[PDB]
Amino acid sequence: SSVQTAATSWGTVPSIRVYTANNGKITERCWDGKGWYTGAFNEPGDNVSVTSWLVGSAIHIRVYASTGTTTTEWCWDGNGWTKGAYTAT
Amino acid sequence: SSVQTAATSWGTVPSIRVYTANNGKITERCWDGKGWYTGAFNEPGDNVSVTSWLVGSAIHIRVYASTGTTTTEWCWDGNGWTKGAYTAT
Amino acid sequence: SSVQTAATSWGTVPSIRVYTANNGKITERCWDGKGWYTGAFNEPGDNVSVTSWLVGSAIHIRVYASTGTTTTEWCWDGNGWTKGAYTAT
Ligand SMILES: CC(=O)N[C@@H]1[C@@H](O[C@@H]2O[C@@H](C)[C@@H](O)[C@@H](O)[C@@H]2O)[C@H](O[C@@H]2O[C@H](CO)[C@H](O)[C@H](O[C@]3(C(=O)O)C[C@H](O)[C@@H](NC(C)=O)[C@H]([C@H](O)[C@H](O)CO)O3)[C@H]2O)[C@@H](CO)O[C@@H]1O
Ligand SMILES: CC(=O)N[C@@H]1[C@@H](O[C@@H]2O[C@@H](C)[C@@H](O)[C@@H](O)[C@@H]2O)[C@H](O[C@@H]2O[C@H](CO)[C@H](O)[C@H](O)[C@H]2O)[C@@H](CO)O[C@@H]1O
Ligand SMILES: CC(=O)N[C@@H]1[C@@H](O[C@@H]2O[C@@H](C)[C@@H](O)[C@@H](O)[C@@H]2O)[C@H](O)[C@@H](CO)O[C@H]1O
Ligand SMILES: C[C@@H]1O[C@@H](O)[C@@H](O)[C@H](O)[C@@H]1O
Ligand SMILES: C[C@@H]1O[C@@H](O)[C@@H](O)[C@H](O)[C@@H]1O
Ligand SMILES: C[C@@H]1O[C@H](O)[C@@H](O)[C@H](O)[C@@H]1O
């Protein structure tokens, strides 16, 4: 049908990350002030949400990717993506 | 085809809240630094969005729950979830 | 099944903006501490996400509107809504 997106941003440049769920895959587009590019995030999902927070100026991102009733948390903490501890139960 | 989520976070710990719409009901999973647990929020909806802000250490949360063309705003201001003033028109 | 919403907020009032995709159109409801009102944003879309950031006391808003596989970014920078440079991967 139509794709589904989620977005987050931080600072004042700003940095923006836009996640798109399309045909069962979530990909990431990124803005850091100098043109859009494709990010490192690539995981399966039919639905995506995101949140982020700063510690000082350092960004932490959590992406919630869902297929059917299964949601997986993906974590950015300054050195790549890792699977997080989030569960339903 | 999947559940639909929304997420918010605050502070540096951080705290995180993830809302999931599934089979016409929205439920809440919570992180305050010491493991995921099930939150108090439980209301009807097929779609959810969220935003939040701090007043000191006190979180204020607004959840927008949609069923058909009706969106209800649910408010956390320190003492349970209450309906907010939000309307379509 | 239901309308779909996206929300952002800023400052200490706070100000809130809620975008709703309904029947192929996205509209905007606004809170600046003094009651809900209808905003100027009105554009086509079946799905919506949003983020925002402050530069001094000035809000900047980015709304990601999707129709099929095409996502259009709409930009508020103090002087009306304009189309942004965002493109898909
Ligand atoms: C903090 C920041 O802005 N960092 C960006 C780089 O990353 C992007 O922003 C992150 C916050 C996050 O959203 C991420 O998904 C974004 O991609 C940004 O992109 C990197 O560019 C380099 C080249 O300049 C690489 O392409 C890198 O890709 C890989 C890598 O090859 O190293 C892919 C790999 O799969 C991935 N592995 C994992 C487990 O995550 C790694 C890993 O993320 C990084 O090595 C960790 O540092 O990345 C891109 O991630 C870059 C654009 O030049 O600018 C900032 O550095
Ligand atoms: C301010 C805060 O962090 N409070 C939590 C409690 O509420 C959760 O967080 C708030 C912000 C909101 O998301 C709620 O929906 C969450 O449940 C949290 O749960 C409360 O626990 C008591 C049991 O003593 C009652 O069941 C309430 O109904 C719950 O709201 C507790 C759990 O340890 O942690 C913090 O106090
Ligand atoms: C900065 C601001 O709040 N401007 C208000 C006007 O625009 C509204 O808010 C901006 C950020 C954007 O969301 C617009 O689409 C939205 O209409 C608003 O029209 C006016 C009406 O009272 O009040 C301004 O303060
Ligand atoms: C903030 C926390 O960061 C990591 O430890 C994750 O494993 C948790 O699920 C949570 O996101
Ligand atoms: C923050 C940036 O603002 C404008 O430059 C837009 O054209 C970009 O797409 C981006 O949103
Ligand atoms: C920030 C405001 O809080 C109030 O209590 C609510 O009634 C409004 O709708 C809005 O969410």
Tab-separated table of C-alpha atoms and ligand atoms in Angstrom:
chain	number	residue	atom	x	y	z
A	1	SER	CA	0.000	0.000	0.000
A	2	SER	CA	1.604	3.245	1.034
A	3	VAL	CA	4.954	3.093	2.834
A	4	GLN	CA	5.096	4.027	6.520
A	5	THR	CA	7.669	6.356	8.053
A	6	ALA	CA	9.044	7.519	11.394
A	7	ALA	CA	11.385	10.436	12.068
A	8	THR	CA	13.673	11.814	14.724
A	9	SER	CA	16.154	14.709	14.911
A	10	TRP	CA	18.636	16.282	17.254
A	11	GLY	CA	20.691	19.423	17.830
A	12	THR	CA	20.383	22.587	15.776
A	13	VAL	CA	22.076	21.739	12.428
A	14	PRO	CA	19.970	19.572	12.663
A	15	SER	CA	20.650	15.867	12.167
A	16	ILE	CA	17.493	14.076	10.946
A	17	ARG	CA	16.877	10.347	10.537
A	18	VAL	CA	13.839	9.104	8.574
A	19	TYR	CA	12.979	5.394	8.695
A	20	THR	CA	10.722	3.893	5.996
A	21	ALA	CA	8.965	0.512	6.135
A	22	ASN	CA	8.383	-0.642	2.524
A	23	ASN	CA	7.438	-4.149	1.471
A	24	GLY	CA	8.713	-5.724	4.707
A	25	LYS	CA	12.038	-3.880	4.907
A	26	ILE	CA	13.001	-0.806	6.929
A	27	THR	CA	15.678	1.493	5.559
A	28	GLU	CA	17.085	4.788	6.794
A	29	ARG	CA	17.677	8.211	5.178
A	30	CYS	CA	19.958	10.688	6.889
A	31	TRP	CA	20.598	14.434	6.959
A	32	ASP	CA	23.566	16.004	8.759
A	33	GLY	CA	23.450	19.421	7.014
A	34	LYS	CA	25.111	18.582	3.628
A	35	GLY	CA	22.640	16.427	1.662
A	36	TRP	CA	20.514	13.313	2.219
A	37	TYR	CA	22.225	9.887	2.206
A	38	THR	CA	21.346	6.248	2.969
A	39	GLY	CA	22.101	5.185	6.507
A	40	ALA	CA	23.506	1.969	7.961
A	41	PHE	CA	20.184	0.842	9.417
A	42	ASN	CA	18.588	-2.012	7.416
A	43	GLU	CA	16.278	-4.484	9.169
A	44	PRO	CA	13.039	-6.315	8.426
A	45	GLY	CA	9.729	-4.814	9.408
A	46	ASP	CA	6.267	-3.760	8.280
A	47	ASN	CA	6.022	-0.951	10.861
A	48	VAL	CA	8.624	1.378	12.459
A	49	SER	CA	8.777	3.869	15.295
A	50	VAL	CA	11.767	5.712	16.701
A	51	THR	CA	12.962	7.730	19.643
A	52	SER	CA	16.316	9.343	20.438
A	53	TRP	CA	18.040	11.241	23.261
A	54	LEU	CA	21.255	13.119	23.814
A	55	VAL	CA	23.855	12.618	26.503
A	56	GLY	CA	25.820	15.811	26.230
A	57	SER	CA	26.039	16.109	22.426
A	58	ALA	CA	26.209	12.299	21.819
A	59	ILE	CA	23.057	10.716	20.224
A	60	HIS	CA	21.392	7.461	21.275
A	61	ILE	CA	18.667	6.040	19.009
A	62	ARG	CA	16.112	3.236	19.551
A	63	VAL	CA	14.159	1.939	16.565
A	64	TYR	CA	11.174	-0.348	17.130
A	65	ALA	CA	10.614	-2.694	14.101
A	66	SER	CA	7.450	-4.825	13.922
A	67	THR	CA	6.442	-7.833	11.783
A	68	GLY	CA	3.068	-9.358	12.707
A	69	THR	CA	2.926	-9.178	16.505
A	70	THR	CA	6.731	-9.313	16.976
A	71	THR	CA	8.575	-6.082	17.773
A	72	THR	CA	12.400	-5.910	17.827
A	73	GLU	CA	14.341	-3.017	19.312
A	74	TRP	CA	17.478	-1.835	17.512
A	75	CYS	CA	20.022	0.369	19.359
A	76	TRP	CA	22.514	3.043	18.229
A	77	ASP	CA	24.903	4.103	21.065
A	78	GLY	CA	27.759	5.683	19.073
A	79	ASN	CA	29.328	2.702	17.376
A	80	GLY	CA	26.788	0.833	15.225
A	81	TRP	CA	23.495	-0.959	15.533
A	82	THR	CA	22.791	-3.735	18.078
A	83	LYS	CA	19.694	-5.696	19.033
A	84	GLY	CA	18.190	-4.449	22.326
A	85	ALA	CA	16.572	-6.112	25.311
A	86	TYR	CA	13.015	-4.942	24.553
A	87	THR	CA	10.337	-7.653	24.710
A	88	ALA	CA	6.550	-8.032	24.947
A	89	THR	CA	6.778	-10.353	28.020
B	1	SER	CA	0.684	-6.429	8.096
B	2	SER	CA	1.653	-5.787	11.718
B	3	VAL	CA	1.082	-4.086	14.986
B	4	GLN	CA	1.641	-0.268	14.997
B	5	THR	CA	3.951	1.332	17.557
B	6	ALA	CA	5.015	4.714	18.889
B	7	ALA	CA	7.907	5.611	21.250
B	8	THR	CA	9.109	8.394	23.463
B	9	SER	CA	12.039	8.856	25.821
B	10	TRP	CA	13.392	11.341	28.316
B	11	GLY	CA	16.415	12.230	30.370
B	12	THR	CA	19.823	10.546	30.284
B	13	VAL	CA	19.086	7.253	31.991
B	14	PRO	CA	16.988	7.167	29.917
B	15	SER	CA	13.300	6.399	30.467
B	16	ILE	CA	11.495	4.966	27.426
B	17	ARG	CA	7.800	4.238	26.742
B	18	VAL	CA	6.709	2.099	23.777
B	19	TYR	CA	3.002	2.008	22.846
B	20	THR	CA	1.678	-0.836	20.706
B	21	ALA	CA	-1.699	-0.902	18.907
B	22	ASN	CA	-2.751	-4.565	18.382
B	23	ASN	CA	-6.235	-5.925	17.620
B	24	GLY	CA	-7.840	-2.582	18.504
B	25	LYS	CA	-6.093	-2.115	21.856
B	26	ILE	CA	-3.061	-0.013	22.808
B	27	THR	CA	-0.764	-1.239	25.585
B	28	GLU	CA	2.480	0.170	27.033
B	29	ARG	CA	5.979	-1.230	27.766
B	30	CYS	CA	8.337	0.757	29.993
B	31	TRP	CA	12.036	1.151	30.720
B	32	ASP	CA	13.412	3.180	33.624
B	33	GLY	CA	16.966	1.719	33.613
B	34	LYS	CA	16.306	-1.604	35.343
B	35	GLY	CA	14.365	-3.834	32.896
B	36	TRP	CA	11.233	-3.708	30.734
B	37	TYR	CA	7.828	-3.854	32.469
B	38	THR	CA	4.198	-3.435	31.514
B	39	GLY	CA	2.772	0.035	32.093
B	40	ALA	CA	-0.631	1.224	33.291
B	41	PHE	CA	-1.795	2.558	29.906
B	42	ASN	CA	-4.496	0.465	28.315
B	43	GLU	CA	-6.995	2.104	25.881
B	44	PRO	CA	-8.692	1.325	22.595
B	45	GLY	CA	-7.007	2.228	19.333
B	46	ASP	CA	-5.754	1.028	15.967
B	47	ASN	CA	-3.114	3.736	15.569
B	48	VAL	CA	-0.987	5.567	18.128
B	49	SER	CA	1.373	8.529	18.324
B	50	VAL	CA	3.066	10.107	21.326
B	51	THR	CA	5.004	13.103	22.590
B	52	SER	CA	6.393	14.036	26.008
B	53	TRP	CA	8.217	16.737	27.977
B	54	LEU	CA	9.758	17.225	31.404
B	55	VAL	CA	8.969	19.791	34.092
B	56	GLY	CA	12.022	19.187	36.324
B	57	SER	CA	12.072	15.406	36.895
B	58	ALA	CA	8.305	15.060	36.314
B	59	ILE	CA	7.344	13.603	32.962
B	60	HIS	CA	4.270	14.735	31.051
B	61	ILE	CA	3.080	12.443	28.231
B	62	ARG	CA	0.413	12.823	25.572
B	63	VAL	CA	-0.750	9.700	23.643
B	64	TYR	CA	-2.960	10.147	20.547
B	65	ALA	CA	-5.099	7.052	20.064
B	66	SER	CA	-7.150	6.649	16.866
B	67	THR	CA	-10.084	4.376	16.025
B	68	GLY	CA	-11.793	5.099	12.724
B	69	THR	CA	-11.871	8.878	12.346
B	70	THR	CA	-11.843	9.622	16.106
B	71	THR	CA	-8.575	10.502	17.829
B	72	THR	CA	-8.550	10.661	21.677
B	73	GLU	CA	-5.702	12.354	23.574
B	74	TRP	CA	-4.634	10.617	26.793
B	75	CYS	CA	-2.590	12.580	29.320
B	76	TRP	CA	-0.076	11.509	31.953
B	77	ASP	CA	0.772	14.334	34.399
B	78	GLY	CA	1.914	12.311	37.445
B	79	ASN	CA	-1.301	10.691	38.682
B	80	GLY	CA	-2.802	8.383	36.150
B	81	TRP	CA	-4.014	8.608	32.627
B	82	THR	CA	-6.780	11.146	31.874
B	83	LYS	CA	-8.555	12.393	28.778
B	84	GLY	CA	-7.280	15.604	27.263
B	85	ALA	CA	-8.845	18.560	25.460
B	86	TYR	CA	-7.670	17.528	21.993
B	87	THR	CA	-10.391	17.558	19.293
B	88	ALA	CA	-10.483	17.362	15.514
B	89	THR	CA	-12.513	20.546	15.253
C	1	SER	CA	-9.145	0.817	9.518
C	2	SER	CA	-8.364	4.232	11.179
C	3	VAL	CA	-6.801	7.580	10.645
C	4	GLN	CA	-3.111	7.836	11.358
C	5	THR	CA	-1.376	10.544	13.365
C	6	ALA	CA	2.023	11.994	14.160
C	7	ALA	CA	2.897	14.390	16.970
C	8	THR	CA	5.674	16.774	17.964
C	9	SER	CA	6.114	19.232	20.837
C	10	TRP	CA	8.551	21.892	21.990
C	11	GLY	CA	9.456	24.252	24.805
C	12	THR	CA	7.911	24.541	28.255
C	13	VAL	CA	4.319	25.623	27.464
C	14	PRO	CA	4.478	23.222	25.603
C	15	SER	CA	3.501	23.818	22.010
C	16	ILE	CA	2.146	20.656	20.327
C	17	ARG	CA	1.375	19.874	16.669
C	18	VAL	CA	-0.684	16.819	15.699
C	19	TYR	CA	-0.851	15.777	12.032
C	20	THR	CA	-3.632	13.477	10.884
C	21	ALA	CA	-3.784	11.509	7.609
C	22	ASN	CA	-7.499	10.934	6.804
C	23	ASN	CA	-8.952	9.974	3.440
C	24	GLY	CA	-5.745	10.916	1.583
C	25	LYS	CA	-5.323	14.323	3.203
C	26	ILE	CA	-3.087	15.437	6.043
C	27	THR	CA	-4.267	18.288	8.286
C	28	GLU	CA	-2.834	19.854	11.410
C	29	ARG	CA	-4.159	20.679	14.887
C	30	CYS	CA	-2.210	23.036	17.128
C	31	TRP	CA	-1.716	23.792	20.835
C	32	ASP	CA	0.220	26.842	22.062
C	33	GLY	CA	-1.155	26.712	25.642
C	34	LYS	CA	-4.445	28.462	24.892
C	35	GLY	CA	-6.728	25.877	23.260
C	36	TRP	CA	-6.601	23.702	20.142
C	37	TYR	CA	-6.844	25.356	16.729
C	38	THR	CA	-6.504	24.306	13.084
C	39	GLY	CA	-3.097	24.936	11.549
C	40	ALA	CA	-2.069	26.055	8.102
C	41	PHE	CA	-0.641	22.695	7.012
C	42	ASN	CA	-2.773	20.988	4.403
C	43	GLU	CA	-1.295	18.476	1.938
C	44	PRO	CA	-2.053	15.124	0.430
C	45	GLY	CA	-0.902	11.886	2.044
C	46	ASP	CA	-1.906	8.490	3.324
C	47	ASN	CA	0.791	8.334	6.002
C	48	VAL	CA	2.610	10.943	8.059
C	49	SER	CA	5.537	11.380	10.397
C	50	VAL	CA	7.037	14.531	11.941
C	51	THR	CA	10.028	15.960	13.794
C	52	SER	CA	10.968	19.427	14.987
C	53	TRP	CA	13.777	21.440	16.571
C	54	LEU	CA	14.335	24.939	17.963
C	55	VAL	CA	16.895	27.494	16.766
C	56	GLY	CA	16.783	30.051	19.522
C	57	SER	CA	13.021	30.543	20.124
C	58	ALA	CA	12.119	29.752	16.463
C	59	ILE	CA	10.565	26.355	15.679
C	60	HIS	CA	11.534	24.377	12.588
C	61	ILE	CA	9.220	21.499	11.599
C	62	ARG	CA	9.653	18.692	9.036
C	63	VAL	CA	6.577	16.651	8.042
C	64	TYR	CA	7.082	13.476	5.961
C	65	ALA	CA	3.968	12.798	3.855
C	66	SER	CA	3.687	9.510	1.946
C	67	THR	CA	1.408	8.474	-0.931
C	68	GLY	CA	2.221	5.060	-2.368
C	69	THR	CA	6.023	4.778	-2.366
C	70	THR	CA	6.609	8.510	-2.686
C	71	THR	CA	7.507	10.503	0.454
C	72	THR	CA	7.447	14.331	0.305
C	73	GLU	CA	9.081	16.458	3.015
C	74	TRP	CA	7.275	19.680	3.988
C	75	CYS	CA	9.240	22.371	5.833
C	76	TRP	CA	8.172	25.045	8.280
C	77	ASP	CA	10.932	27.595	8.995
C	78	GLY	CA	8.870	30.579	10.206
C	79	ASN	CA	7.308	31.671	6.896
C	80	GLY	CA	4.916	29.047	5.572
C	81	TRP	CA	5.180	25.524	4.391
C	82	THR	CA	7.612	24.702	1.566
C	83	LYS	CA	8.807	21.501	-0.088
C	84	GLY	CA	12.120	20.104	1.112
C	85	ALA	CA	15.049	18.342	-0.524
C	86	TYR	CA	14.289	14.921	0.986
C	87	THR	CA	14.230	11.979	-1.348
C	88	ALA	CA	13.972	8.238	-0.989
C	89	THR	CA	16.807	5.739	-1.038
D	1	LIG	C1	26.797	10.080	14.535
D	1	LIG	C2	26.654	10.139	13.057
D	1	LIG	O1	25.999	11.070	12.569
D	1	LIG	N1	27.289	9.192	12.349
D	1	LIG	C3	27.224	9.253	10.891
D	1	LIG	C4	27.241	7.874	10.267
D	1	LIG	O2	26.140	7.050	10.650
D	1	LIG	C5	24.812	7.520	10.415
D	1	LIG	O3	24.277	8.184	11.565
D	1	LIG	C6	24.066	7.365	12.694
D	1	LIG	C7	23.568	8.149	13.911
D	1	LIG	C8	23.071	6.275	12.318
D	1	LIG	O4	21.832	6.867	11.967
D	1	LIG	C9	23.623	5.468	11.159
D	1	LIG	O5	22.731	4.418	10.758
D	1	LIG	C10	23.891	6.407	10.004
D	1	LIG	O6	24.431	5.629	8.950
D	1	LIG	C11	27.287	8.084	8.700
D	1	LIG	O7	27.182	6.840	8.037
D	1	LIG	C12	28.362	5.964	7.999
D	1	LIG	O8	29.133	6.352	6.868
D	1	LIG	C13	30.286	5.479	6.701
D	1	LIG	C14	31.127	6.004	5.558
D	1	LIG	O9	31.409	7.396	5.740
D	1	LIG	C15	29.831	4.052	6.438
D	1	LIG	O10	29.061	3.910	5.242
D	1	LIG	C16	29.001	3.537	7.611
D	1	LIG	O11	28.422	2.280	7.279
D	1	LIG	C17	28.785	1.126	8.158
D	1	LIG	C18	30.268	0.809	7.973
D	1	LIG	O12	30.613	0.321	6.870
D	1	LIG	O13	31.103	1.133	8.873
D	1	LIG	C19	27.925	-0.069	7.721
D	1	LIG	C20	27.879	-1.168	8.779
D	1	LIG	O14	26.894	-2.096	8.382
D	1	LIG	C21	27.611	-0.614	10.176
D	1	LIG	N2	27.569	-1.765	11.101
D	1	LIG	C22	26.777	-1.760	12.182
D	1	LIG	C23	26.859	-2.992	13.025
D	1	LIG	O15	26.098	-0.810	12.476
D	1	LIG	C24	28.676	0.403	10.479
D	1	LIG	C25	28.613	1.086	11.846
D	1	LIG	O16	27.300	1.643	11.966
D	1	LIG	C26	29.590	2.231	11.953
D	1	LIG	O17	30.908	1.841	11.503
D	1	LIG	C27	29.678	2.746	13.385
D	1	LIG	O18	30.550	3.905	13.346
D	1	LIG	O19	28.547	1.488	9.527
D	1	LIG	C28	27.893	4.551	7.966
D	1	LIG	O20	27.306	4.175	9.227
D	1	LIG	C29	28.472	8.957	8.261
D	1	LIG	C30	28.312	9.319	6.795
D	1	LIG	O21	29.625	9.518	6.263
D	1	LIG	O22	28.477	10.197	8.977
D	1	LIG	C31	28.439	10.064	10.410
D	1	LIG	O23	29.614	9.424	10.817
D	2	LIG	C1	6.687	8.583	36.888
D	2	LIG	C2	7.000	7.128	36.725
D	2	LIG	O1	8.012	6.774	36.095
D	2	LIG	N1	6.141	6.246	37.253
D	2	LIG	C3	6.361	4.824	37.125
D	2	LIG	C4	5.027	4.080	37.061
D	2	LIG	O2	4.214	4.426	35.924
D	2	LIG	C5	4.748	4.165	34.623
D	2	LIG	O3	5.332	5.382	34.156
D	2	LIG	C6	4.410	6.424	33.838
D	2	LIG	C7	5.191	7.606	33.362
D	2	LIG	C8	3.390	5.929	32.801
D	2	LIG	O4	4.090	5.551	31.622
D	2	LIG	C9	2.623	4.753	33.401
D	2	LIG	O5	1.618	4.232	32.493
D	2	LIG	C10	3.599	3.646	33.742
D	2	LIG	O6	2.933	2.539	34.412
D	2	LIG	C11	5.186	2.548	37.275
D	2	LIG	O7	3.919	1.830	37.271
D	2	LIG	C12	2.907	2.228	38.209
D	2	LIG	O8	2.988	1.201	39.214
D	2	LIG	C13	1.932	1.180	40.173
D	2	LIG	C14	2.136	-0.044	41.079
D	2	LIG	O9	2.695	0.462	42.323
D	2	LIG	C15	0.552	1.141	39.576
D	2	LIG	O10	0.219	-0.035	38.852
D	2	LIG	C16	0.386	2.233	38.601
D	2	LIG	O11	-0.900	1.957	38.016
D	2	LIG	C17	1.513	2.255	37.571
D	2	LIG	O12	1.326	3.536	36.891
D	2	LIG	C18	6.164	2.185	38.416
D	2	LIG	C19	6.361	0.661	38.425
D	2	LIG	O13	7.499	0.355	39.225
D	2	LIG	O14	7.392	2.920	38.222
D	2	LIG	C20	7.259	4.362	38.282
D	2	LIG	O15	6.696	4.749	39.532
D	3	LIG	C1	5.090	30.010	15.527
D	3	LIG	C2	3.594	29.850	15.614
D	3	LIG	O1	3.105	29.259	16.547
D	3	LIG	N1	2.837	30.384	14.662
D	3	LIG	C3	1.386	30.265	14.743
D	3	LIG	C4	0.729	30.118	13.390
D	3	LIG	O2	1.178	28.953	12.691
D	3	LIG	C5	0.982	27.685	13.348
D	3	LIG	O3	2.146	27.220	13.965
D	3	LIG	C6	3.245	26.974	13.078
D	3	LIG	C7	4.465	26.523	13.871
D	3	LIG	C8	2.846	25.932	12.056
D	3	LIG	O4	2.496	24.741	12.773
D	3	LIG	C9	1.615	26.455	11.294
D	3	LIG	O5	1.136	25.519	10.307
D	3	LIG	C10	0.487	26.721	12.274
D	3	LIG	O6	-0.608	27.313	11.571
D	3	LIG	C11	-0.790	30.169	13.555
D	3	LIG	O7	-1.454	30.109	12.299
D	3	LIG	C12	-1.247	31.443	14.224
D	3	LIG	C13	-2.757	31.346	14.425
D	3	LIG	O8	-3.095	31.889	15.711
D	3	LIG	O9	-0.622	31.573	15.497
D	3	LIG	C14	0.846	31.564	15.358
D	3	LIG	O10	1.497	31.793	16.646
D	4	LIG	C1	18.157	2.065	27.125
D	4	LIG	C2	18.345	0.571	27.059
D	4	LIG	O1	19.494	0.345	26.236
D	4	LIG	C3	19.839	-1.037	26.028
D	4	LIG	O2	20.388	-1.592	27.223
D	4	LIG	C4	18.641	-1.863	25.592
D	4	LIG	O3	19.047	-3.252	25.682
D	4	LIG	C5	17.413	-1.641	26.452
D	4	LIG	O4	16.309	-2.401	25.931
D	4	LIG	C6	17.124	-0.128	26.515
D	4	LIG	O5	16.861	0.385	25.176
D	5	LIG	C1	17.022	20.487	7.577
D	5	LIG	C2	16.935	20.628	6.053
D	5	LIG	O1	16.094	21.745	5.751
D	5	LIG	C3	16.040	22.039	4.355
D	5	LIG	O2	17.365	22.314	3.905
D	5	LIG	C4	15.460	20.845	3.594
D	5	LIG	O3	15.512	21.122	2.194
D	5	LIG	C5	16.232	19.559	3.898
D	5	LIG	O4	15.582	18.442	3.262
D	5	LIG	C6	16.380	19.364	5.403
D	5	LIG	O5	15.081	19.088	6.003
D	6	LIG	C1	-0.559	20.332	26.965
D	6	LIG	C2	-2.071	20.322	27.184
D	6	LIG	O1	-2.383	19.635	28.356
D	6	LIG	C3	-3.775	19.833	28.713
D	6	LIG	O2	-4.026	19.322	29.998
D	6	LIG	C4	-4.599	19.057	27.662
D	6	LIG	O3	-5.984	19.177	27.965
D	6	LIG	C5	-4.316	19.670	26.310
D	6	LIG	O4	-5.110	19.010	25.311
D	6	LIG	C6	-2.837	19.652	26.029
D	6	LIG	O5	-2.426	18.298	25.907
